[PDB]
Subunit: 222 residues, 6 copies
């Protein structure tokens, strides 16, 4: 797949690089939306982990809720030692999680981390729609200027309803991935869809995946 | 990887691949009469009986006397467990005559140390406020090291996980109890929707409530 | 294991495995004309006639006179029970208001030595708060209470404000379901805290003798 | 066993469905979507009282003018103008020019003036609508009027009326439907509720023809 | 002395309505986008002029007269000629790229000026909308106009019009639908209600042709 | 004039058949769709074909995507827009947000570009409904005065719900096209529908299409 306009970097997540016809568009952001426990955080961690392990590309993980400590503990579920990557300066977890007890400043923290750690991959996890739209638009634009390739996760509450919470997120993003966890006849089945990738082709519709001891495994069928 | 403690609730430790994640909170959501209080009581009762692990039950609606009375239908002598100092029922109900999260936490905390409890149950208007408040309760409980069941309400069997559409997102673990109409009959089911950082069986599993509490069939 | 009082409403004590738990409140919710008031009235009437248990009926909209006139069609003479001091109808109907209501209810309960209470018919937090306090106080008093509420759909929320079923000990749902062009009445005990009951919907009719439920 | 007395509408089929007609001294809510026959039912009620039983009636209108009411009733061969001339029908015009306490006095005055037994009324907090409609029902009750009051609704199988409260404050509720299925319309009438008395249940098909409403109980 | 009807001469419609539109009254014609509302209102005036020499007033609130005229040439109708002959007046109430009373006075003036028998009107609180519409309807009735007034709706099988009140202050209601099923569109017309008179019930299929609306028998 | 409205060919395969000749001249066509339905692609292909096939210059007005991304992404369809910009055949007007709105002023700037580049085709890409309606009405009217033939895209959130976002856009527009991206049985199917063209005829309902290395391809029948 060399005849496409947009250079892509490989997630090395089994099956995803096939669905995306080469990986995530470089220097752009990809929205990854899903209901609770669909694998958003896992996808964003796996993106960073693979970048470090496979290509020695440093990553920055920005967390807004889960603590770094819990992110690290949970990744051990997959045999990933993120503490060691942090110790080696290859992974930086930026803690923006609220005190257990603005955006401008946040963006500067991110930029600082990206420069300090030489980061090539970024993951960001995770009331007026128009305000959300402009703020997200601003975040996306700043990351692009910096040159980062970014996964940003968002929540949604229905498997076949709005893409994210505010009805605007999918429109200001260059790339949109939807993780679903569909309940039918009392069974759950996980799927991944690439809804859009601006300027390039991709496989369409839903593709099954599982979450196992090895992380996400996606199965393309086309 | 995260360790789990056995609930000894029949069938549940299979569905959860070992029980509830230790040192974390598990959200248990369901419409009215789905078995939420029962699940949270059975969690502490089995902790005491099977493992000599004391428990703290935090009630916001039902009086301790009613919690005790309602458990007799299952042959659980909760009055005896309270008399022995193995179960503490913390009453946080608003007295019909005459909210601060930080006070509750300290009371829970001292109860935990006083009774040397390993297991806690908590039973049970801006979504953004709810989200932040729940996030703080979960964090503070985690800081104490308590393994906690916390129940919440929902109003549809196949709609939102909880009431404000945010509860499942700040919870580490989520269990849904349903009570579904099948023709004119009801069918109860239990689902483990998610457990962060660990594995579990997927989808719904039928259960019944009997004289011995919750009985699940994987 | 918990003591129940018999409603003597045909079929209902079978569905509730012996009647309504004594000293607790039971929510009875339904759309319009589902039989809520009838259930409430029958609960008190049977208590008086069969068990000499006095009752207090609390009405918020229907006048005492219409309550009495409507019951008359079931052959139930409520005016006579009121005359004998076995029934008190408390008129709360229009031209903490709650605390004033509670005190009035308490007084009637003490005065008439009532064992049974029926209460016939905005922000969720406020509703939940007020209702919880009403229920808690009746419990302290030791009343066994039927509390009716409205709902607007047969298979939607239990009651109007989405909280009523969560603060009640017991929940009964009266439905009047349209199937094709025919109506079918059903009763369901959704929940009885601390005890067993039959599950799901059971058909009933309303006749000259009141509610008649068939649980088999 | 003392029955609720009823007065016959002589609307064909309806006195079978209602087991004798409308409850005397009370108000019956007649609700439906646009063009379901609400006004027709309310007029046929008054017209039949006058012609069959020599019971005069008051028609209270809030939007259609008297002249249009009269004009439209000509469709069915009824001469309302003549009945107004004879003092047997009074159309009370409460329609706006291109409050409730005042209206009630107006209606009471008209009832007393014309020996009227039958009244038809044709036709934003839900809480205030509820309390206001309640008062209207109550004062009509004291006068001893037997009243048809129409309301609008916007869905064939949605709320009984517009504000989700009107059915709960009415003693009696009739629903007129105009159901669209597979490009064809079907008129049905349902008596949902009559407090204190019996009635047939569910929907009964009807047509509107040159003779007004014809209901088919079989 | 039941209410009489004026023929629309719209193929199929006068059968459905058992004679046409009730004279001296207003008929609501509601529909989703591109359902044929303007076409119906224009064809009503056009046929009145061509068949009965009854002059018409068309009141436009968005579309310019120029575009109304231009679009009607799709059907082989020369509205510019009819305006020039004084048979039709297109009253421009469209805004430059609200007082209902003033509008009503302009419509009355036009009806008197052109001796019009036929009028088409194309096209925040419901209580306000209800009151204003009722006023407009009442005033057109006192004038003696037979009126078609179009309204928008956003669902094919949802409310009649946008505010949930328009169908209740209208004497007459026609619904145009453009139903999408299995990737194909089907146009239908329904007479929902005609106060004080009879009409056929349910949906009737129609097409928009080079010569305007054609309505066919059920099915 | 005395003729029914004339149309300009889009040369988008299959579309000029569906529209019986192309887009109505001197008017605006709304093109609405959920995310990634091909709205920007449709609006670019309209300008691109105008330039290449008829030497009709074009103005593209972008409200969020930067000109440089518009140009970069169009390379996916084999089009060199930078070359067209260099030759003065295409002008991309950047109305996108400074990362850290007066439609009347914007309209005048669109007019400058239209007059400067002698453009015949315009594409515009892409919360009180009364306010939306009035502003959209004024934009449509001013474009019609200028005489431009315009594609304007809008967003929608459901495949079979509202045409656009505010329930008014499809009513003030002369022409409406809906792009859908329907998910059934885990597969997506793209369709195009011409819902309405005031004053002229068109085929009805949905027609399937794909996006290829040569742009939009609407299947026959
Ligand atoms: N070793 C494992 N084997 C199988 N499944 C696992 C394993 N570890 C974790 N999981 C699953 O992965 C899910 C967690 O995925 P996450 O990426 O944390 O979800 P999420 O979409 O970020 O959800 P939130 O943030 O809690 S709403 C758990 O709910 C389990 O189903
Ligand atoms: N060479 C290609 N072959 C096949 N599909 C392609 C190709 N290039 C792009 N696409 C598709 O075109 C889509 C982008 O189309 P656009 O016109 O940008 O959609 P859009 O409706 O404008 O979406 P927005 O503005 O991001 S909401 C991508 O999501 C791909 O699916
Ligand atoms: N001995 C028993 N046998 C069978 N079912 C029982 C028995 N005891 C209780 N139950 C059932 O258990 C239900 C009570 O379960 P709970 O755990 O109190 O429900 P809950 O979900 O907490 O409901 P709330 O708090 O009132 S909304 C009752 O409604 C009965 O159906
Ligand atoms: N003698 C009777 N025989 C048969 N059915 C009767 C008789 N009396 C009343 N009914 C029925 O009982 C219904 C009234 O039941 P209620 O208990 O008053 O209803 P409800 O749920 O309280 O309704 P509200 O308060 O008006 S919303 C009537 O609508 C009839 O269908
Ligand atoms: N002679 C007739 N033959 C058959 N149907 C008729 C005849 N006269 C009137 N109708 C029908 O009766 C309907 C009018 O009934 P109404 O009682 O005015 O309805 P409505 O429910 O009061 O509607 P509103 O007030 O306009 S919302 C018309 O729409 C016709 O369908
Ligand atoms: N010659 C023609 N042959 C066939 N159909 C035509 C012809 N001319 C126009 N049409 C159709 O008529 C429709 C326009 O009808 P209108 O009366 O303008 O609809 P409308 O309901 O008023 O839409 P608005 O006002 O834009 S929401 C177009 O969308 C075409 O489908
Ligand atoms: Cl899985
Ligand atoms: Cl059970
Ligand atoms: Cl019955
Ligand atoms: Cl009919
Ligand atoms: Cl057609
Ligand atoms: Cl495609
Ligand atoms: Mg996560
Ligand atoms: Mg409980
Ligand atoms: Mg009642
Ligand atoms: Mg009427
Ligand atoms: Mg139009
Ligand atoms: Mg775009």
């Amino acid at each position: 797949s060399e005849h496409q306009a947009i250079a892509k970097m490989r997630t090395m997540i089994e099956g995803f690089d096939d669905i995306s016809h080469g990986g995530l568009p470089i220097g752009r952001s990809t929205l990854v939306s899903g209901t609770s426990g669909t694998g958003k955080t896992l996808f964003s961690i796996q993106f960073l982990y693979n970048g470090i392990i496979e290509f020695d590309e440093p990553g920055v993980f920005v967390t807004f809720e889960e603590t770094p400590q819990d992110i690290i503990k949970n990744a051990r579920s997959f045999g990933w030692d993120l503490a060691k990557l942090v110790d080696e300066g290859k992974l930086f977890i930026l803690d923006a999680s609220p005190d257990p007890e603005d955006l401008s400043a946040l963006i500067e923290r991110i930029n600082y981390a990206i420069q300090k750690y030489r980061a090539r991959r970024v993951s960001i996890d995770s009331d007026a729609p128009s305000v959300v739209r402009r703020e997200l638009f601003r975040l996306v634009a700043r990351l692009k200027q910096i040159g980062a390739t970014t996964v940003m996760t968002t929540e949604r509450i229905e498997e076949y309803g709005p893409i994210a919470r505010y009805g605007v997120e999918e429109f200001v993003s260059d790339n949109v991935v939807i993780l679903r966890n569909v309940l039918e006849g009392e069974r759950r089945r996980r799927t991944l869809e690439i809804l859009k990738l601006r300027g390039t082709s991709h496989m369409k519709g839903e593709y099954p995946f599982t979450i196992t001891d090895h992380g996400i495994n996606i199965f393309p069928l086309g």
